[PDB]
Design a binder for this molecule. Structure first.
Ligand SMILES: Nc1nc2c(c(=O)[nH]1)N(C=O)[C@@H](CNc1ccc(C(=O)N[C@@H](CCC(=O)O)C(=O)O)cc1)CN2
Ligand SMILES: Nc1nc2c(c(=O)[nH]1)N(C=O)[C@@H](CNc1ccc(C(=O)N[C@@H](CCC(=O)O)C(=O)O)cc1)CN2
Ligand SMILES: [Ca+2]
Ligand SMILES: [Cl-]
Ligand SMILES: [Cl-]
Lengths: 159, 159
């Protein structure tokens, strides 16, 4: 299956013109836990943001332009991106906006992090229909010495 | 001599307990390059926020409570903290608020990061009267894909 994994601020904001104004090591730890040993598909801006290949995952970049990093796999189409995952049980799509948009229809699960942050966004998570998704897990945490905002982990399965 | 290093939001707001709502890896790199190979003195909330001993530095924690961890040195007073540092050219004071208040009068240098962020908070960096400090280095940086906000590094020398 294909799963989408994202951190949404209020109003589904996922990205801004510059780095998101938060510091959530626990969210990053949740992201690593749920993507480790899985192939991850991303767009070019997200790759550029990450700054390096994510360790222990097969990194696939979906883009129309030629790639510039020999350490990852560059594909030009959603179909190519999938085939590039080969035979695995679950493919993780990590954004951003357009990539989430194109893969949502084919997705069966969403791993979401809701952060209580009000910001002006540039890109947002596509609108999903809560009537079509079943929340199977949820876990609330307040901001703390190491995390700047409060956040809640959620896993949804397509009804 | 003793120096204070701090990151300030608008109106000199500084953290109190929860992590600050920003993500500035260029600022942490600045912090590291300026404190490496030097003793650092911090209060108990700062120690929790950092989460582990800063490597390459002697970690001194100033608190009235029993010190947990054996890899750091736990002191009960300013004078004990200074003595624990021994004979070095520069002692770095890393906060928080009360700690900065206590060492300010003894400080001859300030490494400051002015962040263009409006954060609501209780604590402020202590009021320093720039007349008694000459600004000797200032360098502004815009927010980018890695850094959430604009920030300006500055070093002031006590005159
Ligand atoms: N939960 C979640 N999903 C998200 C994001 C997020 O911040 N949180 N991103 C928001 O833009 C995107 C991914 N951005 C990432 C940026 C850095 C790291 C990363 O460095 N993680 C390391 C763990 C910590 C060191 C890793 O996974 O190995 C991962 C994802 C898309 N999906
Ligand atoms: N310039 C500056 N001073 C400040 C802060 C800050 O964020 N910036 N602080 C808080 O507001 C306090 C220190 N908080 C800190 C939080 C994390 C790290 C840290 O992990 N530093 C690593 C960098 C490795 C990496 O960058 O992850 C290091 O120094 O080894 C240091 C200080 C006080 N002084
Ligand atoms: Ca449920
Ligand atoms: Cl992208
Ligand atoms: Cl403190």
């Amino acid at each position: 299956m294909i799963s989408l994994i994202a951190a949404l601020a209020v109003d589904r904001v996922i990205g801004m013109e510059n780095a998101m104004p938060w510091n959530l090591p626990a969210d990053l730890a949740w992201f690593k836990r749920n993507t480790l040993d899985k192939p991850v598909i991303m767009g070019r801006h997200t790759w550029e943001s990450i700054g390096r290949p994510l360790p222990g995952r097969k990194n696939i970049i979906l883009s129309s332009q030629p790639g510039t990093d020999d350490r990852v796999t560059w594909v030009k189409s959603v179909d190519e991106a999938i085939a590039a995952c080969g035979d695995v049980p679950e493919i993780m799509v990590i954004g951003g906006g357009r990539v989430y948009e194109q893969f949502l229809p084919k997705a069966q699960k969403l791993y979401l992090t809701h952060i209580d942050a009000e910001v002006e966004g540039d890109t947002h998570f596509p609108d999903y229909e809560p009537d079509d998704w079943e929340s199977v897990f949820s876990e609330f945490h307040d901001a703390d010495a190491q995390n700047s905002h409060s956040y809640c982990f959620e896993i949804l399965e397509r009804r």
